[PDB]
């Protein structure tokens, strides 16, 4: 099932945050593609407007 047992990726741009401090941190999305940083997963989620969740930490 995975799905419910996901991590919700944190999706905003805090005031107090410049870069996604090159936080290298891969995850596997519910879409089933790897994203290289939870931030970038969220960024993609926002740009595309999707309900991606982290299925698990690290690559697919």
Swiss-Prot record:
Keyword Signal assigned: yes
Cystine bridges: 11-42, 20-39, 28-60
Positions of the Kazal-like domain: 5-60
Organism superkingdom: Eukaryota
Gene from which this protein is expressed: SPINK4
GO MF terms, alphabetically ordered: serine-type endopeptidase inhibitor activity
Site, Reactive bond homolog: residue positions: 22-23
Function comment: Inhibits the glucose-induced insulin secretion from perfused pancreas; also plays a role in the immune system. Does not inhibit trypsin.
Protein's cellular compartments: Secreted
Tissues expressing this chain: Synthesized in duodenal goblet cells and in monocytes in bone marrow and blood.
Gene Ontology cellular-component terms listed: extracellular region
Name by which UniProt lists this protein: Serine protease inhibitor Kazal-type 4
Keywords: Disulfide bond, Secreted, Signal
């Amino acid at each position: 099932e995975k799905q419910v047992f996901s991590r919700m990726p944190i999706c905003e741009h805090m005031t107090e945050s410049p870069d996604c401090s090159r936080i290298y941190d891969p995850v596997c999305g519910t879409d089933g593609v790897t994203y290289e940083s939870e931030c970038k997963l969220c960024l993609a989620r926002i740009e595309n407007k999707q309900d991606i969740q982290i299925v698990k930490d690290g690559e697919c």
